[PDB]
Amino acid sequence: SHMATLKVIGVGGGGNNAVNRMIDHGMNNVEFIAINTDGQALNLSKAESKIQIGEKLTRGLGAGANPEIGKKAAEESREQIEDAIQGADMVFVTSGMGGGTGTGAAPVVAKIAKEMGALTVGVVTRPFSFEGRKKQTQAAAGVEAMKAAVDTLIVIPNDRLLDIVDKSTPMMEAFKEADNVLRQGVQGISDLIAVSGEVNLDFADVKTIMSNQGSALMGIGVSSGENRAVEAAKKAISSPLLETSIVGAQGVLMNITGGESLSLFEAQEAADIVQDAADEDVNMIFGTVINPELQDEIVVTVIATGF
Ligand SMILES: Nc1nc2c(ncn2[C@@H]2O[C@H](COP(=O)(O)OP(=O)(O)O)[C@@H](O)[C@H]2O)c(=O)[nH]1
Ligand SMILES: [K+]
Numbered sequence: 001s002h003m004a005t006l007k008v009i010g011v012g013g014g015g016n017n018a019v020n021r022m023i024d025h026g027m028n029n030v031e032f033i034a035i036n037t038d039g040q041a042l043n044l045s046k047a048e049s050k051i052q053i054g055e056k057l058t059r060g061l062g063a064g065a066n067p068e069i070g071k072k073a074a075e076e077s078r079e080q081i082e083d084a085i086q087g088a089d090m091v092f093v094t095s096g097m098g099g100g101t102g103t104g105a106a107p108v109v110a111k112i113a114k115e116m117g118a119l120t121v122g123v124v125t126r127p128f129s130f131e132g133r134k135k136q137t138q139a140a141a142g143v144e145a146m147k148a149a150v151d152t153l154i155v156i157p158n159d160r161l162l163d164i165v166d167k168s169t170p171m172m173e174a175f176k177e178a179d180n181v182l183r184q185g186v187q188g189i190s191d192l193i194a195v196s197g198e199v200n201l202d203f204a205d206v207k208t209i210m211s212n213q214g215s216a217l218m219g220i221g222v223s224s225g226e227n228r229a230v231e232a233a234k235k236a237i238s239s240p241l242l243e244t245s246i247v248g249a250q251g252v253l254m255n256i257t258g259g260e261s262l263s264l265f266e267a268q269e270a271a272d273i274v275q276d277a278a279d280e281d282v283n284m285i286f287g288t289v290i291n292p293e294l295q296d297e298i299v300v301t302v303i304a305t306g307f
Contacts, residue, residue, distance in 0.1 A: 002202070002203060003193075004089040004090060004193050004203040005031070005087050005088050005089050005090070006029070006030045006031070006088070006089070006090045006091075006092070006186060006189070006190060006193075007030065007031045007032070007033055007085060007088045007090070007091050007092070007118075008022065008027075008030055008031070008032050008033070008091075008092045008094065008182070008186060009032075009033040009034075009035060009084075009085075009091060009092065009093045009094070009109055009113075010032070010033070010034050010035065010036075010045075010047070010094050010095070011035045011036070011074075011093060011094070011095040011101065011102050011105050011106040011109050012035075012036060012037075012062075012063075012070065012095050012096060012099055012100075012101035012102030012103075012105065012106065013036070013038065013041060013062070013096065013099065013101065013102070014094075014095060014096025014099075014102060014125060015035075015093075015094045015095040015096060015102055015106065016034050016035075016036055016041055016042070016045055016047075017175070018094045018178075018179050018182060019032050019033075019034055019045065019046070019047050019094070020044075020045060020046050020047075021175070021176060021179050022179060022182070022183050023046040023047065024046070025179075025183060027183065027186070027187070029190055029194070030186060030190060031048065031049070031088075032046075032047040032048060032049065033047055033049040033050075033051065033084045033085070034047035034049065034050045034051070035050075035051045035053060035074070035081065035105065035109060036051075036052065036053070036062075036101060037052070037053055037054045037055075037057070037058045037060075037061065037062050037063050037069070037070065037073050037100075037101045037105075038060070038061065038062040038101070039052050039055070039060035039061075040060070041062075049084045051077060051080050051081060051084055053070075053073040053074055053076070053077040053080075053081075053101075053105060054069060054070070054072065054073025054074075054076065054077070056076075057069055057072060057073050057076075058073065062099075062100060062101055063099065063100025063101045063104065064100055065098075065099050065100045065135070065138075066100040066104075067099075067100055067103035067104035067138060067141070067142060068100075068104060069100050069101070069104060070099075070100050070101040070102065070103060070104025070105035070106075071104035071105060071107070071108055072104070073101070073104075073105055074104065074105035074108035074109055075108055078108075078112060081108075081109055081112050082112055082116065085112065085113055085116055085118065086116070088113065088116070088118045089118060089119065089203065090118055090119040090120075090121070090189070090203075090206070091110075091113040091118040091119070091120050091121070092121045092122075092123060092182060092185075092186055093106055093109050093110045093113065093120065093121070093122050093123070093124075093146075093150070094122075094123045094124065094182055095122075095124050095125075095142075095146075096124065096125045096127070096158075097124050097125060097126055097127070097138070097139035097140075097142040097143055097146075098126065098127035098131065098135040098136070098138050098139035098142070099135075102124070102142070103138055103139060103141070103142035103145075104142070106122065106124065106142070106146060107142065107145035107146050107148070107149045108149075110122055110146060110149035110150045111149040114149060114150065114151065119151055119206065119207055119210055119211060120149070120150045120151045120152075121150060121151060121152050121153075121154070121185075121210065121216070122146045122147075122149075122150040122152070122153045122154065123153075123154045123156070123181060123182040123185070124142070124143065124146055124153070124154075124155055124156070125155075125156045125157070125158050125178065126139045126140075126143065126155060126156070126157040126158060126159075126243075127139050127158055128158045128159055128161075128162075129159055143155060147214060147215075151210050151211050151212055151213060152210045152213045152214065152215070152216035152305060153214065153215055153216060154181060154182075154185075154215075154216050154217070154218060154242065154243075154244070155215075155242075155243040155244065156178050156181060156241050156242065156243070157241075157243055158178070160240055160241045160242075161174045161175075161177065161178060161241070163240050164177055164240055164241070177241065178241060181218065181239065181241060181242070184218075184219075184220045185218035185219075185220075185303075187220075188218070188220050188255075188301040188303075189206055189303075191257075191301075192205075192206065192255055192287070192301065193206075195289050195291075197255065197287045197288055197289040198288050198289065198290050199286060199287050199288040200287065201253065201255055201285060201287035205253060205285050205287070206253065206303070208253075208285060209251050209252070209253040209285055209303050209305055210303065210305060213251070213305035213306065214305070214307060215243075215244040215305070215307045216244065216303065216304065216305050217237065217242060217244055217245065217246055217249065217302065217303070217304040217305075218302070218303050218304075219235070219236040219237055219238075219239055219301075219302045220235075220236055220299065220300070220301050220302070221233060221234065221235025221236035221237075221299070221300045221302075222235065222297060222298070222299050222300075223235065223297075223298055224296045224297050224298070225296060228266070228296070228297075228298045229256070229266035229267065229269045229270040229298055229300070230266075230269050230270065230273055232270065232298050232299065232300040233254075233269070233270035233271075233273035233274055233300045233302075234273055235300070236254075236274075236300045236301065236302040237273070237274060237277050237302055237304070244307060246274070246277045246278050246302075246304055247277065247278065247279055248278065248279065248280060248307045249278040249280060249282060249304035249305065249306055249307060250278070250280050250281070250282060250283060250305075250306030250307070251282065251283045251284075251285075251304070251305045251306035252274055252275075252278065252282045252283070252284050252285070252302060252303065252304045252305075253284075253285045253287075253301075253302070253303040253304075254270070254271060254274055254284055254285070254286055254287070254300065254301065254302050254303075255286075255287035255288070255289065255300075255301040256270055256287070256288050256289070256298065256299070256300055256301075257288075257289040257290075257291055257294070257298070257299040257300075257301070258288075258289075258290065258291070258294055258297070258298045258299070259290065259291060259292055259293070259294040259295055259296070259297070260290060260292055261296070262288065262290060262298065266298070267286075267288060270300055271284060271286065274302060274304075278304065280306075282306075283306070
């Protein structure tokens with residue numbers, strides 16, 4: 001029997017913001033690591049494990065939006081980063097691209113985790129257009145460096161947050177919507193590992209769908225009542241925040257969780273929604289979990305790769 005160790009690593013300001021908000025939300029059976037140049041921010045981190053990088057470089061300040069400083073800071077702290085990761089079977093690295101620390105250090109952190117054998121997933125943001133072309137260009141170079149260093153990468157363009165707010169939505173509420181991509185992905189994988197399914201998926205199946213793949217989609221949908229399976233499957237694959245949509249996916253891990261009423265017909269319906277949306281012949285790794293506590297609720301978890 002195998003119990004996978006999952007860790008979430010925030011790198012730089014935005015990544016450490018995400019870690020703090022996820023801890024506040026509550027996230028058990030997952031270990032958090034906070035990595036930053038900025039000692040003032042790191043002192044406010046809620047993470048159990050904190051690594052200040054580049055103190056000789058920046059004297060405790062941030063990188064001042066220069067990615068070369070973040071890269072050097074991370075490389076010089078490799079051993080400390082390895083020690084915090086040790087034991088991990090899966091590592092999520094989260095960072096905002098475009099600044100100095102995340103852009104430069106997050107790809108180093110990802111490569112360290114990958115060369116320790118952890119399944120390594122990046123979830124990163126691109127800057128708002130109003131932040132200017134230079135920052136977009138720097139972020140683009142960071143995204144490409146992340147893709148070369150992870151097993152799978154999820155990119156959230158911050159511009160998509162402007163598609164989901166009204167004129168009054170607090171910025172922090174919008175940021176929590178972006179956080180949900182990583183948080184619900186981690187939770188869905190943590191639930192998959194913890195529960196034996198009736199059609200069982202385990203961590204080896206997560207590795208099949210995510211190892212050495214590139215772009216990825218991770219989504220969850222919950223629905224009740226009539227047409228719940230179709231509606232949950234549509235919710236799982238249809239986030240407006242994602243650079244990589246479901247279209248073009250050639251591998252999908254899909255788990256359906258329901259009560260004792262979970263029907264074979266509705267499982268096929270949900271699988272068909274995902275196949276049709278990908279517009280490809282999808283290699284599906286299909287799982288089912290009967291949770292008797294659930295009455296009329298159905299949960300559909302999707303991880304899509306192979307773009
Ligand atoms: N969605 C989101 N984006 C953020 C957040 N914090 C910063 N950003 C974005 O991330 C980019 C880099 O900022 P930051 O992570 O603070 O820079 P760094 O510490 O030097 O890596 C910014 O230009 C913003 O686009 C956050 O909490 N949420
Ligand atoms: K399992």
